[PDB]
Design a protein around this ligand. Structure first.
Ligand code: X3U
Ligand code: X3U
Length: 479
């Protein structure tokens, strides 16, 4: 009964406290620290999508087992997303981010030394389970330090690190394992898939190391009744910002903050309680006051992920076909296209970041979705490799804006006590959509050119039609 009023008061006071702390060196530091975490997810996604389907041809496998590994890893990412997103609302943002990154790093490290396909599959699956939790936790964790004045722009600036991780993975793949030799094969060669697997883990290890230095989210502390810890963290933020700005004498004035109020047997009971609470949050996401928002969010996210991850398998085959037609008269191609795509995304992320708080989230999302639909439709007309690459750059440049807007909107539409639960559920749905799109678009490879693009464009059109119905959030305190 009373809790809604108490939480509204908490949000209103928290916004004022953040305005007192201001924006400065602390948020700039946290920005890079969490950017490393996003980069790790980018690296893993690239490895699953482009390296491993290329390595499947050298590692010995039965024909029926060829596509198994990516499916398994994406399902692991789905499970990890739901698990860590749910737990981050009960144990904390920093805690769960540390745990998930540790899992990812440990099993990525272990996968370098295995001597068989089964054990490699196991270790890679658990690495996926680990990394699946990063994005939902990262975005909420960063959002909880941002004042409403420029929260959208600051959240939008965060998405570059994912593309940077993709570029990092592609460059390391080209440098270390050209031709994608993957024999289960090193003897300390420094030019081997084991060394590539190790090098891909560096962003996650650095993320863990840097993240150990950062404080836990004070909003999480306040929502769980820990007044003094939240006060200490907020004082740390204020003092860091003011000392960096050359005003060490300024005093943090906040006096009091609103707050909300055998060994194995004990562990079992604890786990049961945690499961019950996570399930309660997940079911609350479909309560009468959030059901419609959740369903519309599901539709939009599913359609966007479906179209993108279907194109991830459509485009390389189109390039191969065009190259074959031209020749009728490698890793470097992937690295080159990835680098150009990142350079194309960059202007789109700059523009969307600068406009996010100027024109609102809904208009950004709708315009970017329409432009994404049309740019996807244009792919059917490419007659040559250069034109195809240019059109892919166009599509990425326009779609990054819609993904940014939907990230901000997803952050702001859900309350802090279940934000990471909602975000994790949506991210798990996105990875399920990735699985489905990859399989369905793989089924088209032998048939025709146009139907996959028409299908993706229709999916994006439906996504935009749903996106038009979401409520605007610009100019509101973080619920
Ligand atoms: C909707 O379309 C997306 C496609 N991206 N993409 C690429 C390169 N990437 C890889 C992407 C990033 C990550 F997912 F890997 Cl982490 C960004 C990008 O541009 C290629 C290839 F270069 F291999 F040919 N083919 C396609 S489709
Ligand atoms: C709801 O949960 C799922 C989310 N995934 N996701 C990502 C990761 N991307 C970026 C996409 C490729 C693009 F070219 F379109 Cl930017 C594909 C993808 O999966 C980001 C990002 F950091 F990139 F901004 N934001 C969110 S939300």
């Amino acid at each position: 009964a009373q809790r809604r009023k108490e939480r509204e008061e908490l949000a209103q006071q928290y916004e004022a406290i953040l305005r007192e702390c201001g924006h400065g060196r602390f948020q700039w530091t946290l920005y890079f620290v969490l950017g490393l975490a996003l980069m790790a997810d980018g690296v893993e996604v690239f490895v699953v999508g482009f390296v491993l389907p290329s390595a499947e041809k050298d590692m010995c496998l039965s024909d029926s087992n060829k596509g198994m590994l990516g499916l398994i890893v994406y399902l692991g990412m789905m499970v990890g997303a739901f698990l860590w997103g749910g737990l981050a609302d009960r144990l904390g943002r920093r805690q769960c981010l540390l745990i998930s990154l540790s899992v990812n790093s440990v099993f990525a490290f272990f996968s370098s030394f295995v001597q068989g396909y089964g054990t490699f599959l196991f270790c890679r699956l658990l690495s996926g389970v680990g990394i699946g939790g990063s994005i939902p936790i990262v975005f909420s964790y960063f959002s909880e330090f941002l004042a409403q004045e420029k929260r959208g722009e600051h959240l939008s600036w965060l998405c570059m690190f994912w593309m940077i991780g993709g570029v990092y993975a592609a460059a390391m793949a080209w440098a270390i394992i050209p031709h994608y030799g993957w024999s289960f094969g090193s003897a300390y060669q420094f030019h081997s898939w084991r060394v590539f697997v190790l090098v891909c883990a560096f962003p996650s290890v650095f993320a863990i190391g840097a993240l150990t230095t950062q404080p836990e989210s004070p909003r999480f502390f306040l929502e769980n009744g820990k007044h003094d810890e939240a006060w200490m963290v907020l004082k740390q933020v204020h003092d860091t910002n003011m000392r960096a700005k050359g005003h060490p004498e300024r005093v943090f004035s906040v006096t009091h903050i609103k707050t909300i109020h055998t060994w194995y047997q004990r562990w079992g009971v604890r786990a049961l309680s945690l499961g019950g609470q996570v399930w309660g949050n997940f079911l609350s996401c479909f309560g009468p006051e959030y059901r419609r928002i959740t369903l519309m969010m599901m539709g939009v996210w599913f359609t966007m992920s479906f179209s993108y991850y279907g194109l991830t398998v459509w485009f390389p085959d189109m390039i191969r076909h065009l190259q074959a037609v031209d020749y009728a008269s490698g890793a470097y191609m992937v690295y080159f296209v990835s680098f150009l795509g990142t350079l194309a995304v960059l202007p789109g992320n700059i523009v969307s970041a600068l406009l996010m708080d100027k024109i609102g989230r809904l208009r950004m999302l709708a315009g970017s979705s329409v432009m994404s639909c049309v740019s996807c439709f244009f792919l059917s007309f490419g007659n040559s490799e250069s034109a195809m690459i240019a059109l892919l750059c166009l599509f990425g440049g326009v779609s990054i804006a819609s993904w940014n807007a939907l990230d901000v909107l997803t952050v702001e539409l859900y309350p802090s006590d279940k934000r990471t639960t909602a975000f994790g559920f949506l991210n798990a749905l996105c990875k399920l959509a990735a699985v489905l799109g990859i399989s369905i678009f793989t089924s088209f490879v032998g048939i025709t050119k146009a139907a996959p693009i028409l299908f993706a464009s229709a999916a994006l059109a439906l996504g935009s039609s749903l996106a038009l119905k979401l409520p605007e959030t610009r100019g509101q305190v973080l619920q």
